[model samples]
Structures are given as structure tokens and as C-alpha cells.
Target: MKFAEHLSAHITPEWRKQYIQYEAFKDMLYSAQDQAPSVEVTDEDTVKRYFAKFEEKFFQTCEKELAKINTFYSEKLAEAQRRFATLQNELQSSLDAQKESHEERVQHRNIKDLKLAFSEFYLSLILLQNYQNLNFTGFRKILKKHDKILETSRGADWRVAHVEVAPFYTCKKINQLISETEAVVTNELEDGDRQKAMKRLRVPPLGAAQPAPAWTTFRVGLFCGIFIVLNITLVLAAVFKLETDRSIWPLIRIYRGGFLLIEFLFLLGINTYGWRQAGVNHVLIFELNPRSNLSHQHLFEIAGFLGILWCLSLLACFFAPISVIPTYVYPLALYGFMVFFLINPTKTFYYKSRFWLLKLLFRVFTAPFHKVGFADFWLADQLNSLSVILMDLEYMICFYSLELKWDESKGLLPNNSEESGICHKYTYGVRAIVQCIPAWLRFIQCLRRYRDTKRAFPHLVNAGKYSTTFFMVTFAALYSTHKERGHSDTMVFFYLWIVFYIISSCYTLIWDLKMDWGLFDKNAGENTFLREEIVYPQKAYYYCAIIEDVILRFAWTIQISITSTTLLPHSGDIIATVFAPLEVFRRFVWNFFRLENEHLNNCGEFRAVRDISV
Candidate 1:
């Protein structure tokens, strides 16, 4: 028997007061129970009889408890009604007295009174709806009474009078009063009348301990190094071809697709799992005042919507090669939708200008490389050069775009000679643009840190990452296609674009993983860096983890489907068509995840506490 059961068997309520009697009872019960021989009760009749007796006792106890609860609730209901009545009367009296004051004072008082009255009325209604099980008719009747009062009191400052008087007749208000009363009565009838009960409930088990900070830092550095090495190797192999017959283009494309798919999956999985583990119910639940626990049914509905989108896109991919319908319009429509969905106005404009600038830069810098391979490796080399030049150009452009610049006269741009005023001014502008990348990166890094520690900057984190990823992918696609050589099939450029796409996709996945996995670990109480006291912490962590994981998996599946569909031969703009929806899906997933996270963080207990204190 458990300690509680043993204790209960020993000391009667009356005997509990006598220390000696209590000790004797405890010893006797403990000795008897501990020494009692175990019975081999394999007989079905005996087991059935024992269980039947237990069930009967349980029902009997339940009946007694119910009776006590019902009586207590009845008394509490009356008391609450009486208290509300008293409050109403006092408020009405105050309003009446205030009405005789100066006109300005009277108006101010009336408005104040109205505000208070409305608040109380709404609160009462909520209580009634939530606790009293009031019917629609009852609620309606309560509202009607207030409406009638407002209508009846035409000139006597009805705002104050209506509010002060409404409670008397509102069925909802009465029901709320009754509910409170019921709670009070039930408490009084219970054996234990402690005003603040402290049940010895078990806390959730803590998550596994995290690695040491230094170890974690080392792991992150190692991962980053490995990624860089792999990326460099792939790039070098594509550029310096030793084997004449072996084409690296297809290999690059496959590698790129595979990388992107994996990364996309990682992000989707983390986000979906995080959301589920967090126990977030509705996307907007975090916004609701006095938030309620989320319902599983609501989660199912959200999942269903996402599933439908996934299923439709997959179907489109499967039929892309054979059908003219898939080839011509579907890809374009899908990509178009995605562009609009994912690319915010600011990001779209940034990428447009940025890509244009990159092409201009390539034309200026790599014009010599293009000339060198005109005859021997004309198309292939130009295409290969285009890929390299564009990558380098983007790396530079990203830096310049983020940096804020001074006028060229300030001698900011590299290689700007002070002797030439125009050169100096241009240099300043270039310098500022170049500086922006680090500045922007730092800003984002800080924002992410803040969010991880304090759940701040949710909107920026959500919207910014989505926007950045979308712009990066779209720009790469456009750049690859824009510089395609005539001799090589357009498919070659398409394939190359896929490879670049995969690289960016993989980078994004790894980046997101590094940033977010820590957050989950922290939230799950696995991180030694910080600790939090959350109710149902394990459930919360589990829910968040699940949501994040699901989203990650779904995103990858979508990416793969889109890529495979686009690769198949089709007439009349198949690639462009498919690109549209793929873009839309990317944007949609990004926004949805952002919105959901923002909402969940907003509803978190720590946030609630901070808000309340503030």
C-alpha cells in the first residue's frame, strides 16, 4: 500500500489529535499490513465479488460527495447573487448622487460609470457562459434587459443609469453570481476548508541535460566548417574539370536538389514539432484574453488544411511529364502564386535591384573569362562562369545591400582615389552598401538572441527569414536562367539552377536548425543555461516539438515534389509554371509558421507575467 493509504488506514479523524493514539494506530496498521500474507486469489468468483464491492463503495462515496457539492453550490449561488445586488445598489446610488453635480462632472462621471458597468456586464456574461451553462435564450434575455433599460432612460444620462441598473435584470449576470456562489458553497461543505489548497501534485519530469556551452559552441563551429568544406568541394569540382567525358552539371543538380530537400525538411520538422510540443491550440489562441488550453480538434483542422495543399501539389508533380496540362500552365501558375505569397513588397524590390546589379557586375568583371573560352568551351564554360560569377556577385551584393552608405565624396568605396571627386563619392556609396551586410547580420543575430532568451521580436524573426529565403531562391533561379548560353539546352540552365537552389536550401535548413534546436532544448528544460517553472512543462515541450517536426517534414516533401515535376520534359513553359506554386508554398509555409510562433510566444506564461507586471 502507498504511504497515503497506510496513513489513512491508521489514524481516524478523532484520534489524529492524540499523538500517542495516532502513533499506536500507525504502528498497528503498518505492522499488520506489512506482515499480511499475500493471497493467491486466482478464483474468478472471489475476484468479481471483491471488485463489485469496491465499485459499490466508489459509487456510494461519489453520491455523498455530489450531494454535499450540490448543497454547497446552492448556498454559494445565493450569496454571490446577494453580493452582486449590493454592489449594483451602491453603484446606482453613486451615479444618482453624481448626476446632481455640475454638467461637466456629471458627463465625466456618467462615462466612467458606463465603462465600469460595461466591464462588469461583460465579465458577468463570460462567467455565466463558461460556468453556469446558461442557454442562449438566457443570455439573450440578459442583453435585452440592458437594451430596454437604455431605451427607457431617455434623458437621465442613460449610459450611467443603464449600466448601474442592467445587472438587476440580466439573466447572464444572475447566472454568473450563482456560479460563484456555487463554488463558495461547495468549498464550505468539503471536509478541508483551506482557503488556498496546496495539493502535492507531481511536476513534469525534466528533459535530458544539454551539452556544455563550450561543447555546444564547438559542435556548431564543426558543423559550419563541414558545410563550408562540402560546398567548396562541390564548387571546385564544377569549375575545374579534369575528366573530359564526365559532366558535373547533372551531379551538381542532383546534389543541389538533395541538399535543399534535406534542409527544407529539417526546418519544417523543427517548426511543426516545436508548435505541437508547446501545446499551442489555435494560431490566434495566444492573442485571446485569459487564454484557454488548446483543443486537439482545432489542431486537426489546421493540419487538414496543410495536408490538402500538400496532396494537391503532389498530384500536380506526378502528372507533370506526360500531360500537356501540367507542362504549360501549372508550373507557372504555382510559381506565380508562391512569388506573391512569399515575396513581400520590400524583399521583392530588393531582390530585383540586387539581381540587376549583380548581372551588371558580372558583365564588367567576368567579360574577360567569357572571351577566353569562346571557341573551346564557349557555351559550357560561359554557363559555368555564369554560375560562379553570379554566386560571387550575390555574395558581394548582399554585403552592399545591407550596409548603409555615405556619399562617395567621403572616400568610402575601395580603390577610390581621393584625386578624383566622382570616384571618391562612388567609393563612399559602395562602402556603405558593403558595410550593410555585416550590420544587417549583426542586427538579425541580436534579434534572434533576444527572441530565444525573452521571446521578443517574433514578427521580425518570422517575416524576415521567410522574406530572405524567398528572395535568395528567386534571385538564384532568375540569375541562372538570364545568362543561359544558346548552344546548351535551356534544361542545362534549369538543372544548374536546381543545384544552386539546393545549396541555398541546405544552408537555410542548417542555419535554422542551429538557431531553433537550442530553443526547443531550452524550452524542454534540457538546457542548463536557463530554467523555467511552467505548468505541464513536458506537455508544452512535446507539443512544440511535434508541431515543428511536422512542418519541417511537410516542407521537404513539397520541395521534392516541385523539383521532380519541374525536371520532367514538357512543352510551353512548364518550368516557369511549376515554379509559381512552389514559390507560393514556400511563402505560405513561412508566414504560417511565423504567425503561429508569434502567437504561441505571446501566450507563454513568462510573457503573460511580464505583461501583467508592465
Candidate 2:
């Protein structure tokens, strides 16, 4: 009995767990035939390997049981490991593959759902923009291709990590941002506005919406197109003045906080519109919150509003001192918000760094500039490397803040779910802006990886990548334009930059359109259609929408559109395009600083920690 007890301890998780759990393991001890044959293996490593073998299947989102292997050794652990796999296999066989059949059904259902939703979104181009290079058959083929890709990639590492992009997020705790009931995303957009969005990028309308009449759509598009061209022509005329007057000094002379604010003002609508469109709840309320039940749409608004204010302050700083900007808010309070805004962008719901990355980088960049002793340079280098860590630590202080009173506040739950509020979203946007400078190396590498396997991002990462490119180019234009002014007159430089923007925007939209266009066309050509029109409808609905999108591409060059009454594209493409470099810059900063998380052990590569652990 004593020997059997000792053997049971070494065997670790008993083999009988599959058939009969708990004391059944003990019951099996009485039957020699049922028991595993006695073995001399005593390597702790080998023993641990055998014990860890049951969980060979690997899935992170599901939970990594990966002492995981296939066609592999853990051979010494094989009997016990083999038994576990057998049990799982039998469970499958017992159910007669109900799980497999169920998965098939789910995929087929998802295919149908995606087919419907994507078409609603995609077909709007033709419906609203009056654009089409492919037929209905072509459209269906692209959708089928999209369906195939998503289903085949149902289980991959990228899918697990990227499920909640929060592109616009609260950092951690994904998968539950929106409630089923919260559909009031578009209280602001009128019948006119919605039609324009549908017309502009082929964006779909909210709910079961219908398209407007062609005459109305075409007239709206035509008038808007002329207005946009005139605006660009005006800017060009302004540029001509810069060259003619060399007297463009008056243009910069007229520029003030108003001019600076104008550049980012589009965010007002974009953020509000984003808020109006998505059905999710709030992203930012109060980072260390008493839990605001505010909508996430409102949170995006907070980001846009507060974030633009912050940028306004920075521009004021660039033109003169920070004090030049007028504000009712105290300099102190604003500074405090900026501090958190800079440090806690993601609001790290779980982990954080030892200290702020900004402070650390400052100390590092300046340390090399300062007079250094023998070990001081090395110390600075060490600190610099450590500052590059990835863990965002908001969740850290929520657990242990110095102010115990605040920590103990009722309803404050020291968790991400309870804490996300207005502050988080605003700070997130601000931090993103501050990080701009572009991380070319990582962006390049990421592009390389994407080209090879499209493995880094499961969605349209290209839009983001091109946006980053535009940011870099815009900055160059601004810098060159500034230098060209030489304090003489920037009017010429300004117009050139605007012209550059229009050209770049045209290509950006075109590039995105081309990538999707060719794919659907090829797919359509391959798939046989019942009739060409069945796959690609040739109705007026299709042609008008196609024309709308085409005009929009050109219209966007001048920041004009029927959908957007604003001076700029209401989508805030300006902010997104210019600030896209921030993500790149963040990666660049982290790369130099070497900020990262601890490498997780290959739970997939399971090995027992016991003696003779194979």
C-alpha cells in the first residue's frame, strides 16, 4: 500500500482521470492490470514531462495546455500522454464528431452572414458612389474569397491577439465593448449626411437603410465636386501669391491659434461620427473611475475634443510659449492631465513598467549629452534599455495606490472593466499623437512580414501602412516648406504642401481601391455566375454609387464633399494620416529602448519538471 501510494505521487496526474476521476485513480491501484507498468525512470525532467503530457493541444485564447506536441517526443512520457490523447479522441468518437459537424455549420453560417454584411458595405460604392470596375459576379467572388480566408484562419495566433484592435480602445480586456441594445450610434447624421458617407467611400448606411434617388445623389455629388475644385484652385491661387508677392509674409502674419486649430478641427466630426456609428459602450470615462455608464461613442468624443485641445496647446507652444494659448483651465490641471495622457495611453489594465517611458527616454537621450563618469554612461544605457518595456501599468496602481482613501472608494473596483472612462480615451489619443515621429524600421519589417504571409494583421493593415507613409511625406513637406520660407514668406510653401496633400490623398484612396478591385475582378472571372447581372447588378443603383466614390476620391483632394459640409473631410483623414507615424514612432522608440514583456515559456512545448523529464 505504501509502495502504491509512493508510485501514485510520482505518476503525477493519474491516468484514470479520463475514465473515472478522483478516487477512481486510487481504485485503479488495486488492479495490477489496470495500473501503468512499473518503470525505473527517475529523471525529474523526464517525470515532469510525462505528467505534463495530457495537455498537448495548443490554443492561447482557449487557454494554452501546450505541454503540447505532435509527432514529437515526450516519448518517455508517451504511455501516460498517449492515454490522455486517446481519451480525447474517444470522446470525439463517442459523440460521433458532433463537434466537427457543429464547426462546419458555424462556418457556413458565418459565411452567409459575412456575405450579407460585406455586400451591404461594399455595394454602397456602386449604390452611393456610382462606381464599378467589376460585375455582380465579381463582387460575389470577392466576398466568397473573403469568407474562405476568414474561415481557414479561424484558429491562428494573429486572430487571437488582434480580436480586439481597440484601434480606438481602452488597452486591455477585449471582446466586450458594445451591448446588444446600444444602437444609437448615429443620432447626428441626417438623411443627407448618411447618403454622403455611402456615396463618399462606398460606406454602408445604418440598419436597413435605402438609397436615395439618382437625380438627388448626382446633383449633390456634382455641386460638391465643383465646390471642392474651386477650393483647391483658391489654395493654388494663394500659392501663386506666395511666389508672386514673395510677400506671402502676410499669410503667416494672419495665422494664429485659429489657423493651427483649423488643421485638426475635422476631428470634431470624425470622432463624433465614429461615436455615432459604432454600437459599443464607452472606451474612456475616467481611467481611475467611479465607473461612468457613458457610451463608448461619447468616449471617442472625449478623445477628439480633449485631444485636439492638447494639440492646439502644442501648436501654440511651437509658435511661441505655451502661455500664448488662451484657456480657462489652469496650467496646473492641464499639465496633470497631460502627464497621465503621455504616460498611460493604453491604460494598461493589467501590467505597467517600473517608471514612465517618456521620463526614462529623456534621461537617456540627455545622459549621453551630459558629462559622464566611467559607470554613469553604462547606467544610462541600462536604464534606457529597461525603459523600452511593453507592460502598461494602470492596473498596478489601481491595486496599490499611495492614497488609500481613494483606493478604498466605494464602487471603485480596481479592475479595467470598472475603471474605463472619459479620461482613458482622451489620454489614449493624446499619447498616440505625442508618440509620432515614425518607427520606419519596424514598419518596414512589418510590411515585409505582411507581404510574405499577411500574418501580422488579419485585416486591412494596408490602409494603416499607407496612412503612415502619408504622415512621413507630409512632415517632409512641412519641414521643406518651412525651410523654403526662410522667415521670408510661407504662403508658397503652404500651398505646395496643400497641393502635395491632395495628390497624396488621391493616390491613397486609389491604392486602397485598386487592391480590393483587382482581387474581386479575378475572383469573379474564375467563378461561374448564373448570369453576369445576377453576380454584378447593372441597375442605376450600381452606376451612380460607383460615380459617387470616384468623384469622392478627387473631391477629397480639396477636402470637399456633399456628405461632409465641413472645410475638410469629416472622416478626420488628416489627423489619422498625419499621426499614423505615431504608431511607427512608438515601435521605433521601443526598439531603441528595448521595452518588452517577459518571454512566456512555450506552454505548447510541455515538459515535466520531474526527474528524467523527457
Candidate 3:
């Protein structure tokens, strides 16, 4: 039994070895089945020919089973390697696509967050300016909320390494950690922070709400007072001196020149200080609280008031006592000065032109009258009026053009008028003209109202009064000089003209003061001047009222009616021609400084930061 057992054990070992070899052979066969080409090849004939030649050379030394086993293993290894390469390529492509999507999302989110932060910051700033009692604690809290959102929304890479994930993990494990981290971060992030995290962040400062300094107020008052006093004294002295000796006339002329100088200095000082103060305040307010509605409103009010003041000063030049100066010359000079005021005359001359002769002529001619009557006031008024008309005309044109085009790109008007008839031509012109009538009427009504209010006294009112008065006085003086054989004696008619001039001057001055006082008193609280509450209807109403009372009611109505009915073909055209220069000057002035303000507002200092990763 022992001998049989030993023999069985030896036999069993041999069988086990055979079984192991058979199993390996089956594995190789299975691998070969997997690698075998599923499709038939057209090039099999060529491949078979090569294989046949190789086989003939190697068949004598090789066993069939060993060859099959070697072929099967080789095919299996090659198939496996190819599959690995394909899978690796696909995986890499997928990862790259995911990374790109994530980056784009981050950038988009950042921009969104930045915009949100800026909006919120601006709103807060505006609130602070309007509401003086706004607490810093509340502002800080708001800021913190925004900050926290930003901190979390920022990209994971933006975070510190330790904060994002532990560094010890394998790549696969790290990916898992990042996924988990993203989920947590996203869940906790605020809307604003999420937007920021996706891209960049922007925040604005809180401005304080305070009144203008007392010193500034005093200075402004002083300037206005001095201007009023000097002009009044000069007019009174001229009236009194008219009846005195002929020698007194020269002294009165000297006094008049001194008053002109004083008036010029006072106006220049007011304008310069007013402009500088407005600019500095605007910047300071913008910095303190970029969102302050009140500050912006105040800034605009100051600008508008300054424009009015400039117009007033220009009108004052007509009253100057220079006997040689023509009445028309005053209007012309006012117009020219206003143009400079609008476009920064100094800057325009310096930068836009280099004609030495022109420069020299302007300097020589304008130097003496730089503060008073150097430029053309009438020209300014005419231009300013024309601009409004043009703007209205443009609007009408655009409207008509839109109709022709049917709101499409096809029917657009050409720069050249000849080519613009693709759309109905006369109809557009008629429509534009029809549309312009109402605007023209409105403008006339406004002018009439201004005239009645004595506001127009400085521009049109003063122009007419001063021009007529000056003509009468100069004519009387010239007649006296000629009749008396250059005796330089004053006539009764001259005294009468001088008295009329003084009365007109006093009336205008007092009227202006009253108007200013009324405005100041009415707008005492809440910086009411800063309020943009005036509607078109109110303007129209005021305009209509003034026109009805002043232009239509005056004894000179017959003359105005005659002029309107016969001389001026179109009242609109007459008004436009008369006021175009001033409108242009005003617009130019407004535009010149507006550009700087807009640029400053757009700069980075005025920007805000938004979402950042925590």
C-alpha cells in the first residue's frame, strides 16, 4: 500500500504540472482570440505571401504549439498596450476640457462679482451723502458681508495651499479632495462672492454730507457785493457829473474806467473761485462717496449757476462808458468772449492755432478789454440759440429717418443730401419743420418770460436798453461837440440821456439782486438748488406766463409785432440768429469740463473690488 501511495504521489505531481501548462495555454488562446482582427483585410494576399516565406525558413527548427503560444502572447500584449494608449488620450482630453470650462467660469464669475460690489459700494456712498446720520458700523457691516462673499467666491488656486487641501494625498485622492472642497465653498458662498469667485472684484468709498464752508460763502457774497456797489456808484456819479462843468466829464470817464476794472476783477475772481470750488468739491465728494446722489446734484446745480453768472457778466459789458465803442461792438465782443468761456478760449487759442499774426492781433486787441468787453456777447447768444435749434433739428431728422428705414439698416440717410432721397425727401423735411414749430414756439415763450422776469435784462433786455441809451447819449454828445465847434460842453439832451442811462442801470441792478435774493431764500434748506425737480411742463408754463406778460403786454408790443410780422420772416429764425452764439458758447463750456469729469469717474480710483476667495 506504501509503495502504491509513493507511485500515486509522483504521478499526481506530473499530472499537476501538465494541468498547469494546459491552463497557461488556454489563457494564451483566450488572449489571442481577443486580439484577432474582426474585419477581413484586402491586403491579406501580400501578408500571406510574406508569412509563407518566413514560415518555410523557420518551420524546420520550430514546434507548432510553441509558435502558436509565442504568437498568442505577443498579440495579447500589443492589444493591451494599444487600449491603454487610447484610454490615456481620451482621459487627457476630458481633463483638459474640464480645466478650460472651470477657468472660463472663474473669469465670468469674477467679473460679475466685481460689478455687484461696485454697485453696492456706490449705493452706500450715495446714501451716506444724503443721510448725514448714517453710521459707520452699518456701513462696515455691509462691507464685511460683501468681503466674506468675495473671500469664498475666489478660485481654489487663490486660496492658501493648507486652506484648500492637505498636500499629502495622491493625484486621484487630491482630485477627490478638491471636489469636496468645491462643494463646501460653493454652498457657503454668497451670490456676490460666487460671481466674484468666477472672475475679479471692484468697492467705492463712503462720502460725508456737509455744507460748504462759511468762508467760501463769504467770499462769494463779497465778490457779488463789490460788483454791485462799484457799478452802482459809477452810474450814479455819471448822472450827477453830466450837469457839471465839461472838465468833470473826463473825471467821470476815469471813474467809469476804474469801475470797469473793478467789475472785471470781481467777475473774474468769482468765476475762477466758483469753478475751482465746484471742481474740488466734486472730486472730494466723489472720493468720499462715489454713490452720493446729493453731491452729484449739487455739482450740476453749481455748474448751471456758473453758466448763468457768465452770461450775466457778458451782458454787463454793454454798459461800459467808452464813447468810441460801437453799440454793435458790445454784442460782438460778448459773443466772442462767451465762445472762449465755453471752449476755454485760452486753451483753444494755445492748442488749436499757431498763427503768430492772428495770435498777436488777438493779444493786442483783447488785452485792454480782457476782463470786460473783449469778446462778442451777441455772437455768443446767437450761437447758443442756434445749437438748441440744431439739436432739435437733428432729433427731428433722426425720427424721420427711422420711419423711412422702418427701424432697419436699409433706409439710412447718406452724408450727402443728394443720395438721401432713397426715402421720401420732402415728407421728412416737412415733418422736421412741423416738429420744429412747437420747439421754436417754446423757445420764444421762454425768451419772452425771461424778458418779463427781468432775467433777460442782462442779455436781450440790457442789450436793447444799453444800446439805445448809449446811442442817444453819444448822438447828443457828438451834436453838442459839433454845434459848439468842439467846445466840449454838455447839452441838456446829453444830461437827459445820462439820467435815463442811470435809471435803467439802477433798475436792472436792483432787479437782479432781488431775483438772486428770492432764489437764495426759496432754496435755503435741503440744497434745494441741487434738486433736479424741474420738469418740461413747468418750464413751458413759466415761459408762456412771461411771454404773455412781457412781450405781449408792453407798450412796445406794436413795434415787436411789426418786427415779427414784417421784418423777421420767421420768429424762430430771428431768435435762432440772435441767440445761436450764446448757446454754442454755453454748450462748448459745458462740454469742455464734462469730459474731464467723465474721465475721472471712469478711472480705477473710482472703481470697486468684488469677489475674492476666502
What do the candidate models score in CA lDDT, each in turn?
A: 0.36, 0.31, 0.34
How many collisions between residues are there in candidate 2? 58
Q: Which is the better candidate, 1 or 3, if ranked by lDDT?
A: 1
Q: What TM-score would you give candidate 1 relative to the actual structure?
A: 0.27
Query: Residue 272 CA error for candidate 2 (Å)?
Result: 11
Number of the top candidate by lDDT?
1
Cα error, residue 546 of model 3, in Å, equals 16
lDDT of 1 by residue, 272-320 (tens): 4455444333322322222222233323332333333333333343223
Which sequence of candidate numbers ranks them by lDDT, best first? Answer: 1, 3, 2
Model 3, total clashes: 59
Name the candidate, 1 or 2, with the larger TM-score value: 1
Please report the TM-score between candidate 2 and the true structure.
0.24
lDDT of 2 by residue, 1-614 (tens): 23333222322111111111223322322342233234574666664454334212212312211121111213322443343344334433533543347787755564444323323323221221111111122222322333342243333443335322212122211111111001111121212344443333232322211344565445545544554564465566555533332222112212222222322233333433333232111111101111112222333333444444444443332223344333212322434564565566574522233133454455434542333322233233232212111111221222234212332322122223345332212222232222222223223333444555656553236435445434534444444435544655545555555656566556655543444222124334423321121212233433443344454444333321111111122443344333332322322222211111000121222321211100
So what's the TM-score on candidate 3?
A: 0.23
